[PDB]
CSV table of C-alpha atoms (C1' of nucleotides) and ligand atoms in Angstrom, one decimal:
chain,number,residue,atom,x,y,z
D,1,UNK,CA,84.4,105.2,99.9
D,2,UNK,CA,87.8,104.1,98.2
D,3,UNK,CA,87.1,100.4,99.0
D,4,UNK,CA,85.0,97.8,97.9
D,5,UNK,CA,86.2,96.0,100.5
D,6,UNK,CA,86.0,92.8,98.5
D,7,UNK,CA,88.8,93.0,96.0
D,8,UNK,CA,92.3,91.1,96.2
D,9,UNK,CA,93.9,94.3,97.6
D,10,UNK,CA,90.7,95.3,100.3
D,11,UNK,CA,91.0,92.0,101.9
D,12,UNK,CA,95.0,92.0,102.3
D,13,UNK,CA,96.1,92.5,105.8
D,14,UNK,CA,99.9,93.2,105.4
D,15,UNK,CA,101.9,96.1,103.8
D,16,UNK,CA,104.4,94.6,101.2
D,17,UNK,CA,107.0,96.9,102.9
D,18,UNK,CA,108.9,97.8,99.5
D,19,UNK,CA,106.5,99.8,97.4
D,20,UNK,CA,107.1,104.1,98.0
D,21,UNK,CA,103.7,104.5,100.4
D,22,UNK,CA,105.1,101.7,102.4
D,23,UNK,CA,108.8,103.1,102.6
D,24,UNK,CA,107.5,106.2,103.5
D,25,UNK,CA,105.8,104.8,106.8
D,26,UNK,CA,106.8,105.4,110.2
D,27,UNK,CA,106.5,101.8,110.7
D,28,UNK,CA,109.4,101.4,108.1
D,29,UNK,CA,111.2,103.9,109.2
D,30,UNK,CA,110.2,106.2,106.5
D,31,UNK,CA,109.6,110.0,107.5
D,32,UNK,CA,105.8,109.7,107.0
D,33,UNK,CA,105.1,112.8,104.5
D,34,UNK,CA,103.1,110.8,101.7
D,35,UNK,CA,100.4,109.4,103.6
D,36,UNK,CA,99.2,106.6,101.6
D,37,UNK,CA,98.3,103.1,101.9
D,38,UNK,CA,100.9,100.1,100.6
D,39,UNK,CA,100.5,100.1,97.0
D,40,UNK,CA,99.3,96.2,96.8
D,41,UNK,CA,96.5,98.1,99.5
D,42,UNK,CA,94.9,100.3,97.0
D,43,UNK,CA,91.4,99.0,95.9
D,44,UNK,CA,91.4,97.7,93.2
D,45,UNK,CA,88.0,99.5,92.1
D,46,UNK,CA,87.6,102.3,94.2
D,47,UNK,CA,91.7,103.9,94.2
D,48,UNK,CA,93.2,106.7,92.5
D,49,UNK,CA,94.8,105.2,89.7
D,50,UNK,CA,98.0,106.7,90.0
D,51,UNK,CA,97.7,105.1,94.0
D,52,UNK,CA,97.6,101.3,92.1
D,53,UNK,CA,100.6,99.6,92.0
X,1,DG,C1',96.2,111.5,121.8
X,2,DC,C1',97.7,108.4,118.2
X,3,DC,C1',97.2,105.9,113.9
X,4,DA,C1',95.8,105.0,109.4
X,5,DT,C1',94.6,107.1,105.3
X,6,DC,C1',91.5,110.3,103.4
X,7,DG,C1',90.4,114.6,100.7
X,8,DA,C1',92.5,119.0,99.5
X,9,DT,C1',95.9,122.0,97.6
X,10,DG,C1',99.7,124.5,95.5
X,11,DG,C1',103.2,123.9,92.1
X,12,DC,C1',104.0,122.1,87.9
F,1,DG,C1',95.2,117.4,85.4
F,2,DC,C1',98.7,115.3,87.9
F,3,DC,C1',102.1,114.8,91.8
F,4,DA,C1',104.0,115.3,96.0
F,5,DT,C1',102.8,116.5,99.6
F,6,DC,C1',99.8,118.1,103.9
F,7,DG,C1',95.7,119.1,106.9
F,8,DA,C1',91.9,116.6,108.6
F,9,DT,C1',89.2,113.3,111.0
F,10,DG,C1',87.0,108.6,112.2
F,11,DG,C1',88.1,105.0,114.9
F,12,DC,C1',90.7,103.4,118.2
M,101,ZN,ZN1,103.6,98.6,100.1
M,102,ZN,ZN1,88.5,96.8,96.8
DNA sequence: GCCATCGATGGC
DNA sequence: GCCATCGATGGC
């Protein structure tokens, strides 16, 4: 629905860490109140714009 | 029940 | 219409 699930950023596995989305993770210690995949994440088709990196 | 991440929403 | 959230839910 927002993936192709065939472009660069659909078939990436890892969060770059950095970007906001990512520093807003749990896993990265962030307080989790965004809610978005990692930026590099976003399909490159399929995303909200303003999600793209 | 939690996680990953979506659609929705209120403020601007 | 857009952003910064926030409620919701599929998949685990
Ligand atoms: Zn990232
Ligand atoms: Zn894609």
């Amino acid at each position: 629905a927002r993936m192709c699930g065939e472009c660069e950023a659909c078939r990436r596995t890892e969060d770059c860490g950095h970007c906001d989305f990512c520093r807003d993770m749990k896993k990265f210690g962030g307080p989790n109140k965004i809610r978005q995949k990692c930026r590099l994440r976003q399909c490159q088709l399929r995303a909200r714009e303003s999600y793209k990196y």
